[PDB]
Symmetry: C4
């Protein structure tokens, strides 16, 4: 019957969560992942659906997401376990026609529910749909170790943080020319932190939560994972450099300007001006 476990999107959710677990980014339940699907992705699996899908209201109306299906990670669930029991740890949800709530079509067994960061995820999907004319389809949150560490030692400022990350690996300006947004510390699992994240997502594909972690957005699971992996790689390099006493030389303004010109990207002005 096909079997939705072996669908591209369940397999992709398993790969991304497992890979993030192996990176050391997702201790316990600390990360969450949502992927926007099309009806055509799930329609062939209608017989895999729960016969009697559960309904859960959204935190607030989200009419831009009306009729939209997603695959999501569950609240309190461990990225390490996704590969062991996808239907326990993931769910397929479909937002209803008013954007007021969703049905759980598959997964989230034994009364599990979507991630407690659903506001941050779905509100950010709304802003990224608008910002990218529908190209972006993934919001990923993880507890990326070196990025977290840097939030205790670098100025928590979009321009400063972006410039240091650009400097810490040549590809970074090309991968995230729009830079990294950073919020004040905020209480997690709230619609305040969720819309604050979504507002930053209007201008950046990466958003940092000081003393907590990162959110990224992109068109595909691999592109979004790779975005975060790039930023975290640069952060890893920076932690080493700072631990050795700091940069004696680095990528100059530009050199960053030449890089952006070659790759046809416009670097965030404030980060470049530093």
């Amino acid at each position: 019957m096909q079997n939705i476990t072996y669908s591209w999107f369940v397999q992709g959710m398993i790969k991304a969560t497992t890979d993030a677990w192996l990176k050391g980014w997702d201790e316990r339940n600390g990360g969450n992942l949502t992927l926007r699907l099309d009806d055509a992705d799930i329609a062939p699996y209608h017989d895999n659906f729960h016969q009697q899908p559960r309904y859960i209201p959204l935190s607030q109306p989200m009419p831009l997401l009306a009729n939209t299906p997603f695959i999501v990670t569950g609240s309190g669930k461990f990225f390490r376990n996704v590969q062991l029991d996808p239907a326990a740890n993931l769910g397929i949800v479909k937002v209803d026609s008013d954007g007021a709530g969703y049905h759980i079509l598959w997964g989230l067994t034994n009364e599990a529910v979507p991630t407690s960061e659903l506001p941050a995820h779905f509100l950010s999907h709304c802003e990224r749909i608008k910002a990218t004319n529908g190209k972006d389809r993934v919001i990923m949150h993880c507890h990326a170790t070196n990025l977290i560490a840097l939030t205790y030692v670098l100025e928590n400022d979009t321009a400063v943080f972006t410039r240091q990350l650009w400097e810490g690996s040549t590809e970074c300006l090309v991968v995230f020319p729009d830079g990294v947004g950073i919020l004040p510390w905020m209480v997690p699992g709230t619609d305040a932190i969720g819309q604050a994240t979504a507002q930053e997502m209007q201008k950046h594909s990466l958003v940092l939560w000081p003393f907590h972690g990162v959110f990224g957005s992109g068109p595909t699971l691999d592109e979004t994972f790779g975005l975060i992996d790039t930023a975290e790689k640069s952060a890893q390099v920076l932690v080493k450099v700072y631990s050795m006493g700091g940069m004696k030389q680095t990528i100059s303004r530009e050199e960053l300007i030449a890089l952006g010109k070659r790759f046809g990207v416009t670097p965030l002005a404030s980060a470049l001006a530093l």
Copy 2:
């Protein structure tokens, strides 16, 4: 015949020990793990039992554990090897009706015996049963690298250590609001260190052994592993931050207070007051 190797609890012991080995927490024989079971868990496997179960006395009477079965790791056994030969490296034991000793029903082949830290494990199970009205079922000890390193550089004080761990990842206050107990250095494998650990377990779900490692307690293998993983993740972040010259900003008192209110936990007063 079912085959107890494929039981949830043998498989779970394999997963936790293997995962801890991969983390770098359990060189050689350095860690131990005990899980309290119910008779109903093991009864279906009676035919897998040793036909003639061995009897070993406990170090002291433990009448609260009368008639209680456990699955345990063996003395001198390596976490790395559990997956290769579960019955060599694990045993199922059942404490007798007086709490004076136990029978080895399965495993611990070739005259192996339970971990030399059995006092610390079983005495801590007794105190956690009382403290949690029977909810906690696991005691896990590992040589968590960054937590160990921090015991050489942070004040070995419950309030100080707890506050720094809370600061080193936002989730920590929510995961361990009761904080981390820390003992003086003590000679391992003794009932002194075992009851000292058990006494700390009355007030905390995590206990540090300076220059040695950590003990954690929780209701399930994953929750207990995840508790330790959380604390060790924060410790990893802290080691990076301290190596870069220390915190320039951090989570404030709260912010910790707001966090606790949102998640309905009461943070350890002494750690909050700092």
Copy 3:
């Protein structure tokens, strides 16, 4: 029909890219790998070829590579994915009789193309063929973490950098007696950086791209991987030592001289003279 996926060279490309992914050297699309084959390697797989091979021009004429087949990684492709879909992420190309372009005989499906660093790869293959009388067959680029970090803190000078790497593990002088060439930072994906790399390859088997990564050359995939792994291992040791305040003792001039004599290698004079 044999099946070229299971050929030694496809399997070897999978092993090297996967191993480099596991090392943390190849986030996103950040690395590339090319291996020079003989017609006799691919001829048994003619029926696996695309029936209608695509043609792509080279950036400039490369007549030394006329009629030469290679297996290559694709542009924008992830080392992590090579094992999952070799034909999506790798291609077999054969340079035409004038050295002006190549046909894609196998792989690079869905209009993928070879790595954007093809100039650096193929121009370096030309110079290594000349320098080694045809022995070298591999060019590997990765984002080797510790080597990258060191480019922010060590003088970006061939003699200085080579000497520190020699000091950081005893084998290094024996593995790379010719030292490590290092370029100025340059914009990637250009023929300028490609021939600059190729010129350094005339004199060294390793070339560093500051703030970016490393290129290595060797006769086989394992020897080339092992060359880079050796340099990166030494770099890892050095990052630790520098983070602990620097060397209190080290390998002397040599001792390096005695080492070279025993193993019959001539160490780079400028690095030795320091």
Copy 4:
């Protein structure tokens, strides 16, 4: 026919080399491993032997090893590859009746030969046979990262180095009460470094090669691996502590004395006296 690949000793050599590769201790060909067998181990596999075993002389007479079989890693071979092709990368050798040379009974295909550190291995086996009344059976060399790093920053002195390693994890005094011998830097692959190593092995189960790596001896593969893993774990902890500015508190003289008394070991006097 049984198949010697699946013998306990070939499987054990695969496990130890693979595990050491995963630890990051054995880049390229950098490590070597030898295990002393009994005739009874190999006799059941006589039909797996090369029909016409090769003979190679030893570097010097070793009559204590007369008629003794070993399984060994090959010169220039990679620990990473042992699992992929055991017979290419390992050999079974049997020393002849005069101790003058050995026959390659199995493995070391395509004219491979035993490790270039065979003097250090076999001479150390001789001294450990005498020191342990035949109990020790394994000599393992690896490029243990943190131990290497410490040789640039700690005094290369047996007492000093041993005491710091004892301090860096509580188990270390119990695992290696005889301490760690350390040689001056010496040119590798020589009988000078081999007997110098063997002489240190008279008094210690671990020997450090500054700026290079470690040798360990023990009765079984797991015990020897675990010995090295323990020392390297402590070294890892120490590198973190030193990078954070050094110890503010540590294990006292003890405390070390009490530890040794409890576990019935006599700690190396010179290290204790510090």
